Amino acid sequence: TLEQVHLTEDGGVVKTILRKGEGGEENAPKKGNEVTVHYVGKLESSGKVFDSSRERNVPFKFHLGQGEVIKGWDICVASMTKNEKCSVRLDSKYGYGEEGCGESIPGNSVLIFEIELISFRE
Amino acid sequence: TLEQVHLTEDGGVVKTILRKGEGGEENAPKKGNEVTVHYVGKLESSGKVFDSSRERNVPFKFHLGQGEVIKGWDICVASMTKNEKCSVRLDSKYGYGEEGCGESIPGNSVLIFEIELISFRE
Ligand SMILES: O=C(NNC(=O)[C@]12C[C@H]3C[C@H](C[C@H](C3)C1)C2)c1ccncc1
Ligand SMILES: O=C(NNC(=O)[C@]12C[C@H]3C[C@H](C[C@H](C3)C1)C2)c1ccncc1
């Protein structure tokens, strides 16, 4: 019943909106903007959480579209609007690829992130 | 001739100040503060740069002391003051450990980061 939006043509970044954000230009973030989000990241296969800003109780901030984050994140957040909450499924291409990252992210891992866009600014 | 400051007792985080920052309480950042830095990260062995905010020409921001970054970074930046520029050598314990992170960071890699603390805020 919830729509799944394919943000790439290879099925590699698939976003499901769990809560719609606010409409209007003033509510969609722009390339380079500092975006403030909460996220929980888990492996698709095991469901094991590898990283969470919610566990930190500190909103995470990055500069949109500049490669400060994995590519699936730049693509997913570019599609979001203020207050939007989503679950995105990232193929390893859009994640940490063949080699993974640390113990908690094996090579060739599909990652599932719940991401809430809290605010942004220039 | 330049001092090397061992910020842990295991030799794992060794900081060399290349340019002294400004003194005074108002110029040392506090746990939880948003710190704005430029960095260039390279592998010690090969010297190959794996990541650089300077190449992005976008200052990188994180929340100090909250595990938003590798542990060597939390330790190193906690010791810095506004405008300080340093080179820190991180044993893999304080980096990406046994498994590394992606192609560009093999397991058991010593990382060398040049880090400039530009500003911070609460
Ligand atoms: O992990 C790297 N950048 N980080 C990222 O893309 C993220 C991945 C997780 C979800 C958000 C916040 C944290 C944890 C950092 C984005 C990285 C990749 C390769 N080499 C060094 C760092
Ligand atoms: O790499 C992760 N967090 N990122 C980090 O600690 C850094 C490492 C590099 C220097 C700064 C800016 C970028 C690149 C992210 C800090 C990470 C580790 C494990 N799992 C997911 C993300």
Side-chain angles (χ1 to χ4, degrees), chain A residues 75-93:
Chain A
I75 298 171
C76 186
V77 183
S79 77
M80 298 180 80
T81 57
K82 191 185 183 298
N83 200 53
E84 179 180 324
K85 178 175 285 169
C86 75
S87 174
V88 66
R89 164 189 204 278
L90 302 181
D91 272 319
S92 74
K93 175 172 186 178

Side-chain angles (χ1 to χ4, degrees), chain A residues 34 56 58-61 63 66-68 96 99-103 121, chain B residues 34 56 58-61 63 66-68 96 99-103 121:
Chain A
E34 172 202 289
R56 287 189 307 264
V58 181
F60 182 72
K61 294 169 161 164
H63 304 297
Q66 266 136 8
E68 273 185 6
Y96 292 102
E99 306 307 321
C101 194
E103 65 301 359
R121 74 194 253 272
Chain B
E34 172 202 289
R56 287 189 307 264
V58 181
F60 182 72
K61 294 169 161 164
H63 304 297
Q66 266 136 8
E68 273 185 6
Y96 292 102
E99 306 307 321
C101 194
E103 65 301 359
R121 74 194 253 272

Side-chain angles (χ1 to χ4, degrees), chain B residues 8-52:
Chain B
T8 61
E9 300 199 322
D10 52 22
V13 184
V14 174
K15 186 192 62 177
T16 302
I17 285 185
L18 303 174
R19 175 177 83 229
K20 199 71 176 200
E22 297 311 310
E25 54 253 49
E26 75 274 15
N27 290 328
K30 288 183 81 66
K31 179 192 173 146
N33 290 13
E34 172 202 289
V35 309
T36 291
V37 302
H38 261 310
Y39 68 94
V40 179
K42 61 155 168 186
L43 307 169
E44 186 181 50
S45 66
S46 71
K48 189 152 177 42
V49 176
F50 53 81
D51 189 25
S52 172

Side-chain angles (χ1 to χ4, degrees), chain B residues 88-103:
Chain B
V88 66
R89 164 189 204 278
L90 302 181
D91 272 319
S92 74
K93 175 172 186 178
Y94 292 99
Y96 292 102
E98 266 182 59
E99 306 307 321
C101 194
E103 65 301 359

Side-chain angles (χ1 to χ4, degrees), chain A residues 5-109:
Chain A
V5 189
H6 280 47
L7 291 167
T8 61
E9 300 199 322
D10 52 22
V13 184
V14 174
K15 186 192 62 177
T16 302
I17 285 185
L18 303 174
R19 175 177 83 229
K20 199 71 176 200
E22 297 311 310
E25 54 253 49
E26 75 274 15
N27 290 328
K30 288 183 81 66
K31 179 192 173 146
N33 290 13
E34 172 202 289
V35 309
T36 291
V37 302
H38 261 310
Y39 68 94
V40 179
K42 61 155 168 186
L43 307 169
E44 186 181 50
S45 66
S46 71
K48 189 152 177 42
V49 176
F50 53 81
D51 189 25
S52 172
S53 64
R54 299 178 180 296
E55 183 184 356
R56 287 189 307 264
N57 204 24
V58 181
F60 182 72
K61 294 169 161 164
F62 75 102
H63 304 297
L64 182 66
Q66 266 136 8
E68 273 185 6
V69 293
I70 55 183
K71 182 86 171 288
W73 265 54
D74 270 347
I75 298 171
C76 186
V77 183
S79 77
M80 298 180 80
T81 57
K82 191 185 183 298
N83 200 53
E84 179 180 324
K85 178 175 285 169
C86 75
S87 174
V88 66
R89 164 189 204 278
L90 302 181
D91 272 319
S92 74
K93 175 172 186 178
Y94 292 99
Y96 292 102
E98 266 182 59
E99 306 307 321
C101 194
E103 65 301 359
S104 309
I105 306 173
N108 302 297
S109 278

